[PDB]
Amino acid sequence: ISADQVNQIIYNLHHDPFEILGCHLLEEGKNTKKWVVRAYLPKAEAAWVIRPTERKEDPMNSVHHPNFFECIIETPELNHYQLKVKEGEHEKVIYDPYAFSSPYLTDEDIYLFSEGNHHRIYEKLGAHVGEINGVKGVYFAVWAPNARNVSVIGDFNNWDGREHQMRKRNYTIWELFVPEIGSGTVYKYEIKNSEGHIYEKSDPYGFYREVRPNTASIVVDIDNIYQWHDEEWLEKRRNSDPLKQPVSVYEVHLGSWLHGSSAEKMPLLNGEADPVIVSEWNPGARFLSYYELAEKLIPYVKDMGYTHIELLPIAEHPFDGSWGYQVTGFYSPTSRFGRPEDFMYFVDKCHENGIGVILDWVPGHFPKDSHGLAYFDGTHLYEHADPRIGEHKEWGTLVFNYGRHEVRNFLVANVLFWFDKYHVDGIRVDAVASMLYRNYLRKEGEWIANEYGGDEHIEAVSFIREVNTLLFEYFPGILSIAEESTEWEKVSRPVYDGGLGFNLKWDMGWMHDMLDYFNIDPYFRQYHQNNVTFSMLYYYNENFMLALSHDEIVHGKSNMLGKMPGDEWQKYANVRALFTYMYTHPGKKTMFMSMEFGQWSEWNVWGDLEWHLLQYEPHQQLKQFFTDLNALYQQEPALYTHDFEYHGFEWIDCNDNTHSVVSFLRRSDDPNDSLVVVCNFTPQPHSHYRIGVPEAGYYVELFNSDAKQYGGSNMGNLGGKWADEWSFHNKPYSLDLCLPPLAVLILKLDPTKVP
Numbered sequence: 001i002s003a004d005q006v007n008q009i010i011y012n013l014h015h016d017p018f019e020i021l022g023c024h025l026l027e028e029g030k031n032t033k034k035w036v037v038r039a040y041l042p043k044a045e046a047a048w049v050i051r052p053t054e055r056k057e058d059p060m061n062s063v064h065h066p067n068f069f070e071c072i073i074e075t076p077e078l079n080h081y082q083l084k085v086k087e088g089e090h091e092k093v094i095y096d097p098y099a100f101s102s103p104y105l106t107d108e109d110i111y112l113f114s115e116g117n118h119h120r121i122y123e124k125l126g127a128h129v130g131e132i133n134g135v136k137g138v139y140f141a142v143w144a145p146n147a148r149n150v151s152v153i154g155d156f157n158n159w160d161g162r163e164h165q166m167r168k169r170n171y172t173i174w175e176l177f178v179p180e181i182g183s184g185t186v187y188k189y190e191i192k193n194s195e196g197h198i199y200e201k202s203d204p205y206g207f208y209r210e211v212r213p214n215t216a217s218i219v220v221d222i223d224n225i226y227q228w229h230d231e232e233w234l235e236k237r238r239n240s241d242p243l244k245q246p247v248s249v250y251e252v253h254l255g256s257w258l259h260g261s262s263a264e265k266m267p268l269l270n271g272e273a274d275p276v277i278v279s280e281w282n283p284g285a286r287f288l289s290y291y292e293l294a295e296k297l298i299p300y301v302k303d304m305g306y307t308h309i310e311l312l313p314i315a316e317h318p319f320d321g322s323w324g325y326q327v328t329g330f331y332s333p334t335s336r337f338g339r340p341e342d343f344m345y346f347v348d349k350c351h352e353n354g355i356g357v358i359l360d361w362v363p364g365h366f367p368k369d370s371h372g373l374a375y376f377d378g379t380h381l382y383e384h385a386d387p388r389i390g391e392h393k394e395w396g397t398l399v400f401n402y403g404r405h406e407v408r409n410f411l412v413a414n415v416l417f418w419f420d421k422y423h424v425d426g427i428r429v430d431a432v433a434s435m436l437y438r439n440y441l442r443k444e445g446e447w448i449a450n451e452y453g454g455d456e457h458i459e460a461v462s463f464i465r466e467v468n469t470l471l472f473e474y475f476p477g478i479l480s481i482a483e484e485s486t487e488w489e490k491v492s493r494p495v496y497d498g499g500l501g502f503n504l505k506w507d508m509g510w511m512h513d514m515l516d517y518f519n520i521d522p523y524f525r526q527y528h529q530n531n532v533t534f535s536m537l538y539y540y541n542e543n544f545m546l547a548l549s550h551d552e553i554v555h556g557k558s559n560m561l562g563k564m565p566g567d568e569w570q571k572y573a574n575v576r577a578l579f580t581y582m583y584t585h586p587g588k589k590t591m592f593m594s595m596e597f598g599q600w601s602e603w604n605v606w607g608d609l610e611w612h613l614l615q616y617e618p619h620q621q622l623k624q625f626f627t628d629l630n631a632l633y634q635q636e637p638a639l640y641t642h643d644f645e646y647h648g649f650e651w652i653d654c655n656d657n658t659h660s661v662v663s664f665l666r667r668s669d670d671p672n673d674s675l676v677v678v679c680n681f682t683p684q685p686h687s688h689y690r691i692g693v694p695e696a697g698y699y700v701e702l703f704n705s706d707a708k709q710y711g712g713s714n715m716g717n718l719g720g721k722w723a724d725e726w727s728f729h730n731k732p733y734s735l736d737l738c739l740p741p742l743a744v745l746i747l748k749l750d751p752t753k754v755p
């Protein structure tokens with residue numbers, strides 16, 4: 001480029017910056033092409049072009065001006081890249097602001113979509129504010145290749161589509177530009193099928209939706225509604241290995257954490273809306289907005305000391321009672337809680353408070369509702385046509401045709417959409433088995449094998465591996481968590497090693513062993529010591545997340561306190577012992593709302609949590625227990641740096657089944673960060689109980705779950721204990737401890753203590 005062209009950009013004299021900024025073809029070679037990417041980045045000192053799908057990164061050079069950059073790259077196609085932009089000591093990674101010079105679909109967009117590889121398809125499909133032929137308006141586009149006709153119906157034309165019939169392109173996608181309408185427009189697509197039957201559809205790529213049970217899509221100017229402040233969080237994420245950090249997740253269903261009064265409006269970020277009543281049966285209550293949740297949930301979480309909030313599905317879903325697991329509006333956060341920008345504010349405020357956001361994401365199925373994706377164009381479009389692989393009959397839902405390019409593209413781009421537009425830090429996928437097996441919940445003679453004779457759902461396995469490959473390339477440092485309950489191997493291992501590419505898997509076996517164990521009367525736990533120790537045998541085959549989830553405190557399973565045997569003191573003590581053990585056992589942590597304060601009743605998705613219990617001491621004390629435990633977990637490197645390496649854990653002894661006692665070491669990089677953990681899983685205290693330790697010195701009591709401030713009886717070792725030169729558990733030193741009842745001790749050698 002010339003200096004004159006540069007200066008025209010710098011001084012805002014150029015007639016159209018898209019002619020020189022962004023990605024431009026310089027020449028075609030025999031097997032490759034030569035491209036240039038240019039950027040004007042005021043205040044940046046340096047920039048790079050990242051091609052994350054090819055695993056490449058190229059520096060950009062300043063050209064004529066220190067903030068004007070060019071980068072010349074040879075590659076057959078340059079569809080997928082990001083700009084890394086350094087301003088002083090800070091780096092951000094963004095998409096190229098000059099990537100798309102028109103709102104309409106190009107030939108290239110249609111080709112990439114037809115092949116399933118348009119990672120940014122949601123920039124063109126759906127509804128977008130823009131300018132065509134010199135006039136501002138909205139461009140709509142929808143994939144419906146077998147429809148006979150499609151029109152746009154909405155508020156602007158009183159729901160009559162005759163003067164807004166769309167144009168079909170390349171036998172696949174319908175489009176229309178509508179002048180002089182903008183964000184806030186309410187609409188649907190009116191589709192006529194090959195039979196001549198006419199029906200109404202919500203926008204599959206819609207960005208906002210009326211409040212259930214109304215289903216019209218609403219236009220959002222999604223890049224001009226919210227100003228983020230989380231660059232430093234995102235930079236630290238991208239540069240960190242979350243597997244080596246503390247990950248303590250508070251799992252939350254937004255509709256049922258806390259309700260407000262329906263006698264007032266729902267406040268929004270600088271505005272308000274009518275209340276959304278929780279149900280016809282509880283008409284005095286309304287949901288809290290994303291804005292109100294940012295003001296209340298976030299400081300509550302921060303004060304408890306969790307690192308992450310995990311949300312039950314917030315994608316738009318028509319029925320409260322699915323808990324969000326039956327989604328129909330994949331590209332929009334549910335309007336129950338307000339607007340897209342209110343959810344953006346929630347996430348930005350999490351990041352300001354040093355809290356990450358994980359979204360439950362639901363790629364496995366979708367319900368039959370007529371506004372949604374089902375039979376979209378008068379054919380089986382999103383779902384597979386054969387019910388043996390296209391329906392989950394026990395659930396009444398439809399299964400995406402993962403092999404169909406544009407379907408795969410809908411879902412792959414959807415995952416990326418949440419990280420791009422809403423800055424989230426991770427996803428969790430429920431019931432992964434439901435996608436992986438062609439015989440899932442199907443009887444003999446009601447399913448068919450894959451092409452090689454097996455039960456593996458090949459197309460699903462390939463989709464999952466693609467999701468995870470792309471997610472980690474585009475957004476390094478995120479969490480991708482699976483629950484897979486069969487024995488599928490390598491779930492949380494890299495795709496290059498034959499894995500599915502998640503980085504964490506819920507340890508459902510551990511969960512069952514623990515909750516079954518603790519439900520046993522303590523005298524009988526001696527016959528089930530193996531529940532305590534078993535999960536450590538297979539532990540190193542995956543990266544495990546230890547989750548005690550929402551699913552465990554419904555349908556007659558009781559809440560945590562009610563699972564435990566004995567009187568009220570023992571029930572609390574069991575909950576403290578279990579969770580202290582969970583937090584010291586190797587693996588990341590997840591627990592569900594209500595568990596941190598000892599709610600007695602089961603989670604009820606139709607009300608909110610029993611917050612009035614926090615007026616009473618035993619609940620307050622358990623909440624303080626969790627507050628202090630989370631603080632300890634973040635303060636002790638041996639609880640999180642080496643979760644997934646042999647070095648991080650070793651049993652000291654687990655042979656004392658008749659007293660239900662176990663003990664072990666946790667380790668980190670520094671040997672002085674080593675911890676000794678001792679567990680007593682009956683209410684019988686022990687007074688001179690020997691435990692082997694590897695070195696001399698004073699072992700400080702960092703934590704004792706029987707402390708009186710946690711509701712315990714206040715037995716313990718009075719702050720710490722000197723080890724004896726008395727060999728035990730095959731170690732050269734030993735501690736002579738008092739083991740409090742139904743309690744866990746965490747001890748740490750202080751090598752500077754004065755004898």
Ligand SMILES: OC[C@H]1O[C@H](O[C@H]2[C@H](O)[C@@H](O)[C@@H](O[C@H]3[C@H](O)[C@@H](O)[C@@H](O[C@H]4[C@H](O)[C@@H](O)[C@@H](O[C@H]5[C@H](O)[C@@H](O)[C@@H](O[C@H]6[C@H](O)[C@@H](O)[C@@H](O[C@H]7[C@H](O)[C@@H](O)[C@@H](O)O[C@@H]7CO)O[C@@H]6CO)O[C@@H]5CO)O[C@@H]4CO)O[C@@H]3CO)O[C@@H]2CO)[C@H](O)[C@@H](O)[C@@H]1O
Nearest residue numbers: 687701702703704705707708709714715716717718719738
């Ligand atoms: O995570 C929450 C929280 O946990 C820790 O803090 C807890 C403790 O774990 C818990 O034990 C307790 O400690 C408090 C304590 O209640 C306060 O009274 C005070 O303790 C004083 C003590 O009162 C003084 O007398 C003095 O004790 C001497 C002791 O007099 C002397 O006899 C000897 O004791 C040895 C004893 O003779 C042996 O028999 C044996 O005693 C055992 C028994 O065998 C057993 O059956 C049972 O009863 O328990 C006894 C205790 O183990 O061993 C004894 C040696 O340990 O030597 C001691 C040494 O002084 O001194 C202490 C120190 O001031 O303060 C402690 C410490 O705060 O409550 C706290 C809070 O709930 C954790 O330390 C804290 O950071 C965490 O927040």
Ligand SMILES: OC[C@H]1O[C@H](O[C@H]2[C@H](O)[C@@H](O)[C@@H](O[C@H]3[C@H](O)[C@@H](O)[C@@H](O[C@H]4[C@H](O)[C@@H](O)[C@@H](O)O[C@@H]4CO)O[C@@H]3CO)O[C@@H]2CO)[C@H](O)[C@@H](O)[C@@H]1O
Nearest residue numbers: 114116144145146170171172379381402403404405406407
């Ligand atoms: O103009 C009349 C023509 O239209 C008719 O063909 C249609 C089909 O009915 C549509 O359903 C569609 O077919 C696409 C399909 O939508 C798309 O996903 C892709 O199919 C891939 C698939 O993703 C992949 O998994 C694998 O199985 O291979 C498939 C084949 O490539 O492409 C399909 C074929 O284009 O669109 C066409 C055109 O609208 C009619 O049947 C034609 O005979 C007729 O010419």
Ligand SMILES: OC[C@H]1O[C@H](O[C@H]2[C@H](O)[C@@H](O)[C@@H](O[C@H]3[C@H](O)[C@@H](O)[C@@H](O[C@H]4[C@H](O)[C@@H](O)[C@@H](O)O[C@@H]4CO)O[C@@H]3CO)O[C@@H]2CO)[C@H](O)[C@@H](O)[C@@H]1O
Nearest residue numbers: 566567568569570682683684685712713714715740741742
């Ligand atoms: O010096 C006092 C005693 O210290 C030790 O007693 C221990 C018990 O061994 C532990 O099991 C525990 O006791 C719990 C008990 O397990 C639990 O059932 C509950 O019992 C209460 C009950 O809440 C209450 O309503 C009423 O009925 O009285 C019962 C009192 O026992 O709560 C107890 C704790 O409060 O902890 C105690 C105290 O550390 C030691 O073993 C005893 O020999 C000694 O007497």
Ligand SMILES: OC[C@H]1O[C@H](O[C@H]2[C@H](O)[C@@H](O)[C@@H](O[C@H]3[C@H](O)[C@@H](O)[C@@H](O[C@H]4[C@H](O)[C@@H](O)[C@@H](O)O[C@@H]4CO)O[C@@H]3CO)O[C@@H]2CO)[C@H](O)[C@@H](O)[C@@H]1O
Nearest residue numbers: 653654655656657658659661686687688689690691728729
């Ligand atoms: O007054 C009662 C006694 O109290 C003290 O003994 C304690 C020990 O200090 C504790 O460690 C524990 O003992 C366990 C032991 O930790 C555990 O390994 C298991 O021992 C098995 C052993 O693993 C196996 O290899 C073989 O040698 O048999 C051992 C004996 O079974 O089980 C032990 C308990 O049964 O608890 C005891 C108290 O019961 C103090 O040290 C004693 O001297 C004192 O008398």
Ligand SMILES: OC[C@H]1O[C@H](O[C@H]2[C@H](O)[C@@H](O)[C@@H](O[C@H]3[C@H](O)[C@@H](O)[C@@H](O)O[C@@H]3CO)O[C@@H]2CO)[C@H](O)[C@@H](O)[C@@H]1O
Nearest residue numbers: 153154155158159186187188200201210214215216217
């Ligand atoms: O103020 C009058 C009226 O406004 C609201 O109704 C809107 C719907 O919520 C919205 O879905 C849309 O309804 C259209 C359907 O979506 C569409 O499928 C088709 O069947 O036509 C409908 C309009 O006829 O528009 C209406 C009207 O704006 C509010 O929710 C109503 O209850 C209220 O009475």
Ligand SMILES: OC[C@H]1O[C@H](O[C@H]2[C@H](O)[C@@H](O)[C@@H](O[C@H]3[C@H](O)[C@@H](O)[C@@H](O)O[C@@H]3CO)O[C@@H]2CO)[C@H](O)[C@@H](O)[C@@H]1O
Nearest residue numbers: 529530531532533534535536537538539540650651654
């Ligand atoms: O070093 C090998 C192995 O040692 C440790 O494993 C112990 C388990 O942690 C524990 O449950 C127990 O295993 C038995 C099962 O509980 C029982 O149900 C059945 O399958 O037999 C098992 C075989 O013994 O004891 C084992 C062996 O000590 C440690 O936890 C592992 O990580 C480690 O690899």
Ligand SMILES: [Mg+2]
Nearest residue numbers: 430431483551
């Ligand atoms: Mg399940």
Ligand SMILES: [Mg+2]
Nearest residue numbers: 527528530531
């Ligand atoms: Mg068993």
Ligand SMILES: [Mg+2]
Nearest residue numbers: 607608609610
């Ligand atoms: Mg309530």
